Amino acid sequence: STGSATTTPIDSLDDAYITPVQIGTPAQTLNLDFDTGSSDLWVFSSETTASEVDGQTIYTPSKSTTAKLLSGATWSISYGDGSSSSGDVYTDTVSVGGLTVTGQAVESAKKVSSSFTEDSTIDGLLGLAFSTLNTVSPTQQKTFFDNAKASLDSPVFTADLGYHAPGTYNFGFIDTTAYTGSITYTAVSTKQGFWEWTSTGYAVGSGTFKSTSIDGIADTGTTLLYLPATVVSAYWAQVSGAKSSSSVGGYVFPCSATLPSFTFGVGSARIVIPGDYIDFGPISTGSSSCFGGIQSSAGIGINIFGDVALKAAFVVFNGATTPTLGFASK
Template sequence: MKISLCVALLAATVGVIQAAPTEQKTHKFTLTRNENFKRDPVRAVAKAHAKYHKHKKGGKGGVTAATSGSGTVPMTDVSGDVEYYAEVQIGTPPQTLKLDFDTGSSDLWFASTLCSGCSSTQTKYDPTKSSTYQKEGKSWSISYGDGSSASGITGLDTVNLGGLAITNQRIELAQQESASFGQDPVDGLLGLGFDTISTVAGTKTPVDSLIAQNLISKPVFGVFLGHTSTGGGGEYVFGGYDASKVSGSFTTVKVDSSQGWYGFTVDSAAGAGTTKTGSFSAIADTGTSLMLLPNSIASTIAKSYRATDNRDGTYTINCDPTKLAPLTLTIGGTKFTIPAADLIYYKQGTQCIAGFGYSNMAEGILGDVFLKNVYTVFDQGTPAIQFAKLA
């Protein structure tokens, strides 16, 4: 499950280049784990579906990003790669909050002391304890496909991403939260999409601010999401990427950012046996756990694994990874493989839920099931997205 803002779908225009981004001075965020968090694949599908339909727009209006900057942040792996979050410092003196980093949304919001109904397990930001807080008072509201919601007012404060101090960043303080947020290990969300889908119009995202305030040297950030089986964790590198995590060269595909997220084209998907699909548009979304495919693509892949449709966006799949073949996505002419073990998302009793599903959308949403098996560089300046195999 992910706390992620509901955003829309797009058809991506893709160009392909074989190149590695220039390595720059960076700063890292590390991810941590929460053993009490429970995964819910049906809820994950519902959230992702609403996330991409809420802000659905027509047209091709592009997004132009300024160029400047560099930095890195460590991440925490939750309950077997279900979710990743970072500890972010807000205000002066700093108040540390656990935030879900989400490339599929663009708001920075979290629990606050203004919220009487927020979970007792959440850390709540207290604006009265920050000397750099400025009251703003714009209203914001977010709702999700599973019925959960949050709302409140905006303010301005210093946001420290692993040593990179963004000043006068707009923050969204929750005054109300639905009870379901108490089940999540995070205190809020940090959106890394484009600013056109910010809930409050005219908001600069944290990446916008890193660029505008010359805190990073390039308008990019690299993402590595770890596997629990190999120690978990992860990191976001703002302004560059971590070369030690990369094997070989990058495959770069241009994206259409007009809908506010990183969309691109997948050339094909290949499941068990000789099964191979045609091309489809997709979105790289760190804020979604599963890999959700367009209906026809998902159906083809599911048949190759003899997976059963649960009629809720999920499939039941064989629980024995030794009896499953890896799933391969070809992007920009390069094949990227999802190991058989990662095709098993959740086991309950003798039943296993697949790491891939569907959400009745034309575009696929490539969440953490895919992204933890590649190194990804999100280039806001071009805009483009770059994938490399892991070292």
């Protein structure tokens, strides 16, 4: 089997991407944030505290003939941005882009933090990291990908995120028309439950490439590119007037700037992030200070190749017995 679904930016900044997902019988379609940095499929639901729902589409398990309470199971998750959610669990039929999993754990939110409430466009998350990170207790549950894997033509999914445009998540096959050149595969460590890999270095604009190992995660659920302070300083030093602002919470730059590109290494290959991808616009409406798309990972504890990086590439998440990550230009 295979699946193919379009993923669409939630706003003009590509702050996140939503992908329609069919849950239950008859289908209830919710727009979920596919997140390769976590491993819970959770949804706004009929059980979500009413004051914490503001425009989201909810899953109502009582209206699904295939929903079953997973008796005794609860979940609770906190994300790197400080947001969180928790609730109980149902199993139900879940389909993405024509690919169906029966018996998928659908984590029904009873509570969500303010960041989720305030985002009316995101009806929940679909985690695509390794199932060892799944938070369901007392019986840990498998991700949609893990459940689908054995049925897939090939044990892979791919992320092809657009810049200010829709893109595609494919399951079970590699679309050879969706990228240019060849795919370079690189080793993955699953020890922390993430798609964790080591970039071989970076360049700033037309500058020379610096060979240096940068361990980080491929995380579709993180907006920006978070790298070591040394790397980030080297980037922003090339932008006149750029500075790190503690009041704002990171690097800002004059909105009048033309940003240089940023290149990262994958083996001997190179992925170029155009300068425009690194512009996240005014810090507040009408401001002439703009927020940067490359930020320091210092104090996160991990480097994160988020959407800013991933959208510059066609990315293969290879869930074979020895997982790997592939990157191609596009």
